A paper describes a structure:
FtsEX comprises a cell division-regulating integral membrane protein (FtsX) and a cytoplasmic ATPase (FtsE) that resembles an ATP-binding cassette (ABC) transporter. Hydrolysis causes a conformational change that is transmitted through the membrane via FtsX, an integral membrane protein with two extracellular loops (ECLs), denoted the large (ECL1) and small (ECL2) loops. The folded structure (residues 57 to 166) reveals a central core composed of a four-stranded antiparallel β-sheet (β1, β6, β4, and β5) and two helices (α1 and α3), an α-helical lobe (residues 107 to 135) harboring the α2 helix, and an extended β-hairpin (β2 and β3). The helical lobe mediates a physical interaction with the peptidoglycan hydrolase PcsB via the coiled-coil domain of PcsB (PscBCC).
Three different structures, with resolutions ranging from 2.0 to 2.3 Å, were solved by X-ray crystallography, each in the presence of a different detergent. The detergents used were dodecyltrimethylammonium chloride (detergent 1 [D1]), n-undecyl-β-d-maltoside (detergent 2 [D2]), and n-decyl-β-d-maltoside (detergent 3 [D3]). In all cases, two independent protein molecules are present in the asymmetric unit, arranged in such a way as to keep hydrophobic residues from their α-helical lobes buried. Different conformations were observed for the β-hairpin and the helical lobe among the six structures, depending on the presence and identity of the detergent molecule bound to FtsXECL1. In any case, the crystal structures suggest that changes in the protein backbone and side chains of the helical lobe occur when a detergent ligand is bound. These changes create a cavity in which the detergent molecules insert, with a large part of the helical lobe (from Q111 to E127) affected by the interaction with detergent. Residues Y112, W123, E127, and F126 are strongly perturbed upon detergent ligand binding, with the hydroxyl moiety of Y112 interacting with carboxylate of E127. Changes in W123 and F126 stabilize the hydrophobic region of detergent 1. A similar interaction pattern is observed for detergents 2 and 3; additional interactions are observed in N131 with detergents 2 and 3, which are characterized by a larger hydrophilic head (maltose). Full stabilization of the hydrophobic tail of the detergents is completed by the same hydrophobic residues (W123 and F126) but from a symmetry-related molecule.
Author numbering: 52 to 165
The structure:
């Protein structure tokens, strides 16, 4: 799942939408997540897309800590501020901007790094 810069789009997900969880909590029971894979589906349907990989904010938070920083006290423990993302690979770099604009239309998307 290593992608070359020139065909990578990062689609960050709204903090209020849980695209990767099949289940959620309702009335104390674990029940089905309606919104599951909506953003994933839209992205994976694009004909110029080759793969769409989930990167959970908790994953990037440990990876962020791995990349220098431990005394980041003033940020950590205080409610992880990172975003769930889809790392998307384009078939050609020519598509990247044609893909990023579309991604930013799909409801549930917060931002998109081209």
């Amino acid at each position: 799942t290593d992608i070359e810069n020139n065909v990578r789009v990062v689609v960050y997900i709204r903090k209020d939408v849980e695209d990767n969880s099949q289940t959620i909590e309702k009335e104390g029971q674990t029940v089905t997540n309606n919104d599951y894979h909506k953003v994933y589906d839209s992205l994976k349907n694009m004909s110029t897309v080759k793969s769409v990989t989930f990167s959970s904010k908790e994953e990037q938070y440990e990876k962020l800590t791995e990349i220098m920083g431990d005394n980041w006290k003033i940020f950590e423990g205080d409610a992880n501020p990172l975003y769930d993302a889809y790392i998307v690979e384009a078939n050609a770099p020519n598509d990247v901007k044609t893909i990023a604009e579309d991604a930013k239309k799909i409801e549930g998307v917060s931002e998109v790094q081209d």
